[PDB]
Structures are given as C-alpha cells and as structure tokens.
Amino acid sequence: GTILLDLAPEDKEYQSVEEEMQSTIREHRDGGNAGGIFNRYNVIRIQKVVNKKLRERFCHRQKEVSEENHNHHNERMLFHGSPFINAIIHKGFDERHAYIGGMFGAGIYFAENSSKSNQYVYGIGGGTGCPTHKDRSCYICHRQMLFCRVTLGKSFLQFSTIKMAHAPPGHHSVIGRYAEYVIYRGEQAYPEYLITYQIMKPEA
Ligand SMILES: COc1ccc(-c2noc(CSc3nnc(C)n3-c3ccc(OC)cc3)n2)cc1
Ligand SMILES: [Zn+2]
Helix, strand or coil: CCEEEECCCCCHHHHHHHHHHHHCCCCCCCCCCCCCCCCCEEEEEEEEEECHHHHHHHHHHHHHHHHHCCCCCCEEEEEECCCCHHHHHHHCCCHHHCECCCCCCCEEEEECCHHHHHCCCCCHHHCCCCCCCCCCCCCCCCEEEEEEEEECCCEEEECCCCCCCCCCCCCCEEEECCCEEEECCHHHEEEEEEEEEEECCCCC
C-alpha cells in the first residue's frame, strides 16, 4: 500500500515545492468564483507519496513513451486538483475517471498554475465549496492538491476545442490552448507530492 513520507519545512525539497505552488498563483477569468480569493496559501504539510505498484506502472509506461519519443520521457512537474486526491494517492490516476466534459476530451487535466488546480479541489467550477461551510473561498477548511510527475512524451498542440478520447496517433499528450496539459492514460502521471493547505484571506 501507500506510505506518506513527511517532508520537513527546513528541507530544500519542501521549499522548492512550496515556492513553485506560491509563485504560480494567477488571476483567473472567473474573478475567483471557483477557487476563492487569495494572493498566497498557508502550506500545512508536504508529503511524498510512496507506492511500489504505482511506481512500477509509472516506470513501465515511461519506457514505452521514451521508445516512441526518440528516447525522451519529456517529463514535467505539474499540479492536479480534484475531489479524488485520496483515491489517487492509494490507487493511482485512472483514465476511467477522466473528465468527460474536458475542453480537450476525456482525459486527466494538469496545470502549470497551482491556482488553476485549486479551482477543481471541491469539484467542477469549485462545486458547492467545502462540505462544512459550502464556501468556495473557505479560509478555514484544509484543502489538498497534488504536484505530479507527468510523462508528456510527444505533445500534440491543440488550439480548437475538440473531444479527444486518446492522444492523436504517434503522440502521448495534448497541450490545449493558458495551456491545459492532458493525458489519456493514468499511468502517465505519478502523484509525487501531496500538499495540504489553506488559501489565505488577503489583508483588507
Ligand atoms: C474511486 O477511485 C478513483 C481513482 C482515481 C481517480 C482519478 N484519476 O484521475 C482522475 C482525474 S479527475 C479530473 N481530471 N481532470 C479534471 C478536470 N478532473 C476533475 C476535477 C474535478 C471534478 O469534480 C467532480 C471531476 C474531474 N481521477 C478517481 C477516483
Ligand atoms: Zn469550510
């Protein structure tokens, strides 16, 4: 099963993960409707997800992609936000749970911006917010997001909203255009870091 390795705040790895999360906050077109209003997060903890079977599947797929991408994985660290974090860390990403309504079809969506992933933690459009207060901008309830290793391989550049089931022939991912990073096989992502946090209320 899954083991969670507790990273200390004094560690460079904890600091690089938090720095990537904090520096990638952006203003979103919905004016904060989905994810809430904030300029920074309060990071509660950062844990490394260790699972032998999940690593094996990730390794297995990585090699196939590498063989088809002139010996390159084209790995990227990307954020993922969804109400399925707990299942993902135990069972792995699963394309049978791909977002069907996604702009680039039934895939698993990742982002360079942590604030983009925060919009999905409580559901599509932020759902009804946290279970306790029904608040999409809740400053109390703890949230979770993942900072993932994503095997992109040969990315297909998509500009039109198209409903793809799988990556196009000879490709391993879709970069849909801010860019949306999409994979269609759960084994092309490893949920490396589990980030537990709160959004913080800006000074009035
Ligand atoms: C029960 O066990 C499991 C095991 C695995 C998963 C899982 N694996 O990938 C995903 C992507 S969800 C996703 N990927 N991109 C988006 C966007 N969303 C998403 C986000 C929020 C949402 O809210 C209801 C639905 C889909 N979910 C789910 C459940
Ligand atoms: Zn709440």
